[PDB]
Amino acid sequence: MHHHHHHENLYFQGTVVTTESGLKYEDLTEGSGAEARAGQTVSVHYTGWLTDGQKFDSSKDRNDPFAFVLGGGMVIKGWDEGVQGMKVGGVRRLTIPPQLGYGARGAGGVIPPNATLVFEVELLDV
Ligand SMILES: O=C(NCc1cccnc1)[C@H](Cc1ccc(F)cc1)NC(=O)[C@@H]1CCCCN1S(=O)(=O)Cc1ccc(F)cc1
């Protein structure tokens, strides 16, 4: 029988994980609550930037939070992969390569073709 070892949970400080897809992430704060898993409707706060510091979007007050079905293709691939394994209360920084973001199409004329994206995401509910 396989057992989980919780390495990334125990030694998260200053740790940048690079996955087989090429996505990179770092837990800035480890969450205390439940774990995000595929199939769940999750709610989050977020800020997105280009590598050079230009902000392109944020979960501003309004009536947010932002919510989506994990693993269901409602968002960019780096988010469907990156949010899985976060715990409620956690803040996670995602560095997303263009293939896991908007690729060569870009978005709205604000995010250019072939852009790497940086996001800081806070998990509120699962
Ligand atoms: O595109 C989406 N899904 C389609 C899809 C599915 C599979 C693969 N590829 C695409 C969603 C839905 C959305 C579209 C447009 C919006 F304006 C707002 C939401 N978005 C996102 O996935 C990311 C990540 C989660 C927070 C929102 N953003 S985001 O901040 O980058 C958007 C943005 C981009 C450029 C801007 F100038 C401003 C906002």
Residue numbers in the entry: -12 to 113
Study authors write:
Macrophage infectivity potentiator (MIP) proteins are key microbial virulence factors that facilitate host cell infection, intracellular pathogen replication, and dissemination. They are found in a variety of pathogens of both bacterial and eukaryotic origin, including Burkholderia pseudomallei, the causative agent of melioidosis, Legionella pneumophila, leading to Legionnaires’ disease, and the protozoan parasites Trypanosoma cruzi and Leishmania subspecies. All MIP proteins share a peptidyl-prolyl-cis–trans-isomerase (PPIase) domain resembling the FK506 binding protein domains of human FKBPs. All MIP and FKBP proteins share a general domain topology in their core PPIase domain with an amphipathic five-stranded β-sheet wrapping around a short α-helix, thereby forming a hydrophobic active site32.
Here, we determined the crystal structures of B. pseudomallei MIP (BpMIP), which contains only the core PPIase domain and T. cruzi MIP (TcMIP), which features the PPIase domain and a free-standing α-helix (“stalk”), in complex with fluorinated pipecolic acid inhibitors. In all cases, we found that the inhibitor molecules bound within the expected FKBP-like domain cleft that forms the MIP active site. These compounds were originally developed to inhibit BpMIP and thus showed strong activity against this protein with Ki values of 21 ± 2 and 90 ± 10 nM, respectively. The fluorobenzyl group attached to the sulfoxyl group, i.e., the group present in either inhibitor, is nestled into a hydrophobic pocket formed by F43 in β-strand 3a and V97/I98 in the loop between β4 and β5 in BpMIP and the corresponding residues F73 and M125/I126 in TcMIP. This leads to near perfectly superimposable fluorobenzyl moieties across all crystallized inhibitor complexes. In the crystal structure of BpMIP in complex with NJS227, the sulfoxyl moiety oxygens are 3.5 and 3.3 Å apart from the oxygen atoms of the side chains of D434 in β3a and Y88 in the β4/β5 loop.
